[PDB]
UniProtKB/Swiss-Prot annotation:
Disulfide bonds join C3-C37, C10-C30, C19-C34. Residues 3-37 form the ShKT domain. This is Matrix metalloproteinase-23, soluble form. It comes from Rattus norvegicus. It comes from the Eukaryota.
Length: 37
């Protein structure tokens, strides 16, 4: 395991497609929102 983010700008990314186009960076930045656990 390890799913752990470190910022609060995920809610905006989650609705911005960050879990599909920018996921490459959200994977370790905010896996809690996009669910990259």
């Amino acid at each position: 395991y390890g799913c752990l983010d470190r910022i609060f700008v995920c809610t905006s990314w989650a609705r911005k497609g960050f879990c599909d186009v920018r996921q490459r960076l959200m994977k370790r930045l905010c896996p809690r929102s996009c669910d990259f656990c």
